[PDB]
């Protein structure tokens, strides 16, 4: 009811199914992995509801998978029956503060049972700390919030392919059986009209020898293969016969250099394919294989069997024969058809739990190897569960995953939307998958199956285009790892309420209607003709009662970020792509305001995001204060929530939280009690709503640039806090320990004015470039003073003491006011890394206002850098006198094909001054009356869902009937334009201009960070060319392409200086600086250095590269 504030809706169809938990993807998977109470609760709830669900927790699955260890005698065994967890010692905030990996202990009951002793000994053993997922789906490792992203991969099973070979002039068919973990086997047919098998692509071979190697005899093989001349030709061409001969042949081919051996061959094949450890096909692998090959209920779990091998041989040959429908091998009749890999039926996403399970399984396998070795080198009766194990592998592997792993990424906390879109993203890049250079045209592009399972709009627009993708809005994960989407059930031409979740392949069977299609007053279709889709992505129509499923809501395909954009249907694909990619980069402002025009979903995408602070009990608030809010429930539990103030975010922005609830207001459970960054009343707000007009203006908005008033600078409308944290460590070295102290050597007294006696700057003392924050001094350096220094000191009577200043200073170009300082000490209870005695971290916080050069952009992919902040009076002011806050070039709109921004503007105006429409009786008037959006007051927001958005007739009618703002007149014409007086000249402009309200965000590509200059600075070590980067005073790179441009002009001297004096020549560089500062002409450059390094290297390969002259040896 009071979940969200009032917001008028322009939707035309009522959505049956509400959006699920937007962040279920990570949390549910990890709950399954832990096997905690929540997982079992969901399992039993699904079981009683009848929905399929796994009854086996991943952790206990892996622990049971590792069978009890047996030696060559198999006398003893160790069973790891049950595990358990306890509350972690450290709080989440404490772990964030003190650099501790948030984790809890993992105890397992190990039971060592020995038959020789005939005794069982039970003991609880601690396997190692286990990192834990906080309630917001973030892993706090070493105080940094990492996130892990699900990974798309090709699921195991049987795959088939058909290709055309130009040389052969005929088609070539192939097949493969890709396993979960084991070695991969392939099977090609009619490579040259014959058939063959790739056993890891070791060498050329035929199917016949493999079949002979197996127990199946030649006679039965002919009997079952007599209906296909290809196989008859293969075998009659086969000279070898008998199982043993084929076995020794394949063994020699696979492992040549040694004589064949029967048992060696047999055990090698068994280990390669029939051993349950090397070739353990995953559960999804068998589930897919039985359906694809048609086998009816084979073994639920187990490695491939010879029956499956013969079944796939049959399938391949049938596909070769041109037959399309064939009887299943030990199964029902099924279609034989080449399968496309891109299809979402064959793409499976590993969620967080599966990845962590795989890594801990690898660690436990290492542990098994180590403990087996120890058992082989251990005496009986000196064996205990607590002694034999070693916890190093498991912790090593889990930490090696949580750090230095592609799927483990740094949280992006620009705003809650960035958090969500980082959580949900699926990444095709990773280990054992589609890498960067492995990409092709086919994989990147969209597929007809990515509908309701992956949003086709938002993907990185950089080189990695299409290799990352956000999950759909209504998407859900299958227990196997496939993605489902809901569909409403349609029967006999009417619409049944029940919703069924369909997967990628199962959707292919039926024909699914479209949600946008109109529906009459009754439950039946309004129109006999209706658009539908079917197998292969075809979009043909089928009138009349023929469909059975229909999309539950129009917004299935679109992702959360994309679905934010209003009037999305009008915008192009590329511009909505850019717009969605940009909303993630906005920065929160000092004060936030919710959008006047925007889809009605922002509230949910804010509440589900973790940044907001929502109540967990339905009580009453007693005391409200900025630091903390205290509430009490009717039961009696008193809960006080702490609001974070100005804590640095990951990217370096404030995370301030405001307070909404008054003192005496009631609370229902889940209600928002405090905003996060970029939020207002719990509704997302990444930017502010400005007044805008479209007109060229003196050339200050040429080629995408932007012009805006100085009222923005004056009212802090676009202003953002920024906090920089920098730390120093009082490390100890060979000569002695470093000291942080106020007594700095060889400095004036004034610089040490704000420093405390301890040597740490005070709180609130403003700093500037070059200042001193904490005064640290080196223990000593071996000083051999120069004669000039000695004379100067002797004349002045000062002592050059051994201690040297190495104090932290504020970085160049950085200003701010210190807000917080934290100090950790060795001898105190706090623990630091080895060697370091004290650490001090200092915050400096400033308030950056919008200025020239700052980027700016809206929601429809229109972005530009500010170009001029003119005074308030120079802005063309509307008839009443209101100035226009921002000016945009119109030349961009038809060319960039994003007409929606224009529509929005008019609707934006309509939201500012409300509309009154009662008894008008026009078509749009009746539509508004039935929808309820008939009467509105000024300032109230409006909601236009992404595809149910307002049409143009409604906007025109509302423009015709806007409420009078002043003097009983409408300032905008029915066309949507208004008359603008000039500001500078003073005369009215020739024709009316378009004006209205637009939501504008402030991207994080600020000018302050990008600026960089360098007179002279550090240099590189191996070769002395200046090291690049702003963080170390780097020089810009003059590239090979850049030199080509300079060589085009015919200018030789500029090149010579750019290549010798300005870098790569240590001798001439100091000379040039001397000449400049003294006032003389620049000297003559010599040879560079990198050439000397190169000739030295080429001399080290035994090549006597001599720098000779025409007249013998050269001078250098």
């Amino acid at each position: 009811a009071s979940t969200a504030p009032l917001r008028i809706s322009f939707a035309k169809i009522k959505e049956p199914l509400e959006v699920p938990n937007l962040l279920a993807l990570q949390t549910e998977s990890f709950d399954w992995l832990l096997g905690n109470d929540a997982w079992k609760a969901r399992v039993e709830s699904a079981l009683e509801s009848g929905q399929d669900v796994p009854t086996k927790s991943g952790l206990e699955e892996i622990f049971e998978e590792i069978s009890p260890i047996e030696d060559f005698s198999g006398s003893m065994s160790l069973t790891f029956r049950d595990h358990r967890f306890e509350p972690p010692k450290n709080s989440i905030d404490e772990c964030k503060d003190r650099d501790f990996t948030y984790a809890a202990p993992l105890f397992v009951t190990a039971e060592f049972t020995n038959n020789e002793t005939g005794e069982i000994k039970s003991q609880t053993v601690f396997m190692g700390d286990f990192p834990l997922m906080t309630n917001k789906g973030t892993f706090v490792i070493n105080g940094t919030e990492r996130v892990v992203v699900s990974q798309l991969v090709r699921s195991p099973g049987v795959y088939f392919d058909s290709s055309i070979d130009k040389t052969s002039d005929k088609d070539i068919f192939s097949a493969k059986i890709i396993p979960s973990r084991g070695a991969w086997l392939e099977m090609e047919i009619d490579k040259r009209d014959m058939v063959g098998v790739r056993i890891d692509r070791k060498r050329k071979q035929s199917v016949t020898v493999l079949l002979k190697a197996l127990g199946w005899t030649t006679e039965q093989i002919l009997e079952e293969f007599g209906e296909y001349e290809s196989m008859r030709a293969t075998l009659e061409k086969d000279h070898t016969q008998g199982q043993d001969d084929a076995l020794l042949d394949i063994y020699r081919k696979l492992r040549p250099g040694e004589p064949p051996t029967r048992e060696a061959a047999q055990t090698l094949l068994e280990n390669l394919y029939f051993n349950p450890k090397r070739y353990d096909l995953a559960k999804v692998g068998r589930y897919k294989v039985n359906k694809k090959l048609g086998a009816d209920e084979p073994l639920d779990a187990g490695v491939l069997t010879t029956d499956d091998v013969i079944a796939t041989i049959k399938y391949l040959v049938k596909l070769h024969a041109g037959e399309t429908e064939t009887v299943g091998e030990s199964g029902r009749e099924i279609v034989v058809e080449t399968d496309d890999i891109d299809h979402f039926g064959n793409r499976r996403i590993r969620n967080v739990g599966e990845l962590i399970q795989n890594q801990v399984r690898t660690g436990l396998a290492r542990m098994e190897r180590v403990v087996r070795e120890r058992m082989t080198t251990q005496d009986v009766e000196a064996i205990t569960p607590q002694t034999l194990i070693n916890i190093r592998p498991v912790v090593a592997s889990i930490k090696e995953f949580f750090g230095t792993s592609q799927l483990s990424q740094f949280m992006d906390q620009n705003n809650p939307l960035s958090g969500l879109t980082h959580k949900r993203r699926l990444n095709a890049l990773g280990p054992g998958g589609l890498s960067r250079e492995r990409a092709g045209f086919e994989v990147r592009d969209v597929h007809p199956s990515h509908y309701g399972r992956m949003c086709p709009i938002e993907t990185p627009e950089g080189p990695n285009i299409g290799l990352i993708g956000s999950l759909a809005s209504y998407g859900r994960i299958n227990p196997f790892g496939f993605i489902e989407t809901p569909y409403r059930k349609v029967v006999e031409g009417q619409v049944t309420d029940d919703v069924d979740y369909l997967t990628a392949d199962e959707e292919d069977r039926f024909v699914i209607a479209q949600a946008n299609a109109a529906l009459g007053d009754d439950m039946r279709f309004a129109e006999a003709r209706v658009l539908v889709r079917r197998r292969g992505g075809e979009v043909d129509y089928v009138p009349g009662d023929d469909v059975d499923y229909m999309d539950v809501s129009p917004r299935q395909m679109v992702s959360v970020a994309t679905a934010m954009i209003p009037f999305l249907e009008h915008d192009d694909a590329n511009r909505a792509l850019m717009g969605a990619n940009m909303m993630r980069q906005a920065v929160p402002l000092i004060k936030s305001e919710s959008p006047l025009v925007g889809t009605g979903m922002e509230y949910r995408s804010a509440a589900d995001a973790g940044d907001v602070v929502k109540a967990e009990k339905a009580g009453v608030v007693q005391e409200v204060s900025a630091d903390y809010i205290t509430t009490t429930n009717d039961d009696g539990t008193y809960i006080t929530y702490r609001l974070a103030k100005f804590s640095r975010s990951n990217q370096g922005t404030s995370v301030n939280q405001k307070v909404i609830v008054a003192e005496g207001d009631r609370i229902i459970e889940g209600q928002v009690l405090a905003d996060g960054p970029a939020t207002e009343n719990g509704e997302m707000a990444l930017g502010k709503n400005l007044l805008v007009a479209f007109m060229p203006w003196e050339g200050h908005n040429y080629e995408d640039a932007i012009i805006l008033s100085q009222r923005l600078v004056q009212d802090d409308v676009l202003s953002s806090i920024h906090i920089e944290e920098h730390e120093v460590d009082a490390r100890d070295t060979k000569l002695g320990p470093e000291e942080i102290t106020r007594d700095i050597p060889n400095v004036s007294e004034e610089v040490l004015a704000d420093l405390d006696e301890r040597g740490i700057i005070r709180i609130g003392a403003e700093v500037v470039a070059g200042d001193i924050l904490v005064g640290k001094v080196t223990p000593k350096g071996e000083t051999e003073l120069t004669p000039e220094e000695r004379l100067l000191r002797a004349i002045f009577g000062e002592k050059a003491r051994e201690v040297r200043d190495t104090s932290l200073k504020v970085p160049h170009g950085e200003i701010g006011k210190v807000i917080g300082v934290r100090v950790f000490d060795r001898e105190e209870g706090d623990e630091l890394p080895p060697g370091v005695n004290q650490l001090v971290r200092v915050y400096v916080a400033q308030k950056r206002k919008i200025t020239d050069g700052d980027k700016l952009a809206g929601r429809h992919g229109n972005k530009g850098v500010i170009s001029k902040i003119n005074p308030i009076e120079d802005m063309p002011f509307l008839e009443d006198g209101t100035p226009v806050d921002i000016i945009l070039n119109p030349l961009a709109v038809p060319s960039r094909m994003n007409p929606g921004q224009v529509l929005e503007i008019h609707l934006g105006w309509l939201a500012s001054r409300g509309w009154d429409v009662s008894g008008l009786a026009e078509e749009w008037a009746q539509r508004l009356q039935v929808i309820g959006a008939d009467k509105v007051e000024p300032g109230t927001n409006v909601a236009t869902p992404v595809f149910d958005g307002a049409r143009e007739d409604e906007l025109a009618g509302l423009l015709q009937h806007t409420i009078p703002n002043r003097d009983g007149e409408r300032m905008v014409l029915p066309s949507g334009k208004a008359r603008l007086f000039d500001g500078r000249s003073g005369e009215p402009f020739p024709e009316p201009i378009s004006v209205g309200y637009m939501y504008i965000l402030k991207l994080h590509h600020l000018v302050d960070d990008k600026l960089h200059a360098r007179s002279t600075g550090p240099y590189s070590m191996i070769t002395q060319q200046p090291l690049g980067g702003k963080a170390q005073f780097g020089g810009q790179r003059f590239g090979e392409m850049e030199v080509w441009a300079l060589e085009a002009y015919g200018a030789a001297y500029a090149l010579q200086e750019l290549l010798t004096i300005k870098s790569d020549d240590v001798t001439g560089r100091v000379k040039v600086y001397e000449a400049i500062v003294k006032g003389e002409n620049i000297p003559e450059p010599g040879i560079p250095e990198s050439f000397k390094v190169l000739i030295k290297e080429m001399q080290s390969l035994c090549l006597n590269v001599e720098v000779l002259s025409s007249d013998g040896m050269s001078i250098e």
Binding site: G1050, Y1053, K1078, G1079, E1080, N1081
Partner: protein, 77 residues
């Protein structure tokens, strides 16, 4: 009062090349600059700026101004 203060076309015609001009103006500017950096040793081979000079200036501008006025000359060895 600008980099483009002497129009280029007149300089080009006297020099006959777009590269001979830059080399010749640069040599003259080097000579003037080294004269201003003489600081009093008074080598006779060096000569001063023929055209009047500002309190602050760059030798190359003076050199190009002489070329435009045409008071100097060049002769390849």
């Amino acid at each position: 009062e600008g980099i483009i203060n002497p129009p280029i076309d007149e300089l080009l015609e006297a020099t006959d090349s777009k590269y001979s001009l830059v080399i010749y103006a640069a040599k003259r500017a080097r000579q003037i600059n080294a004269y201003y950096s003489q600081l009093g040793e008074g080598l006779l081979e060096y000569v001063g700026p023929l055209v009047d000079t500002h309190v602050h200036e760059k030798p190359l501008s003076i050199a190009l101004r002489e070329i435009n006025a045409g008071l100097l000359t060049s002769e390849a060895i």
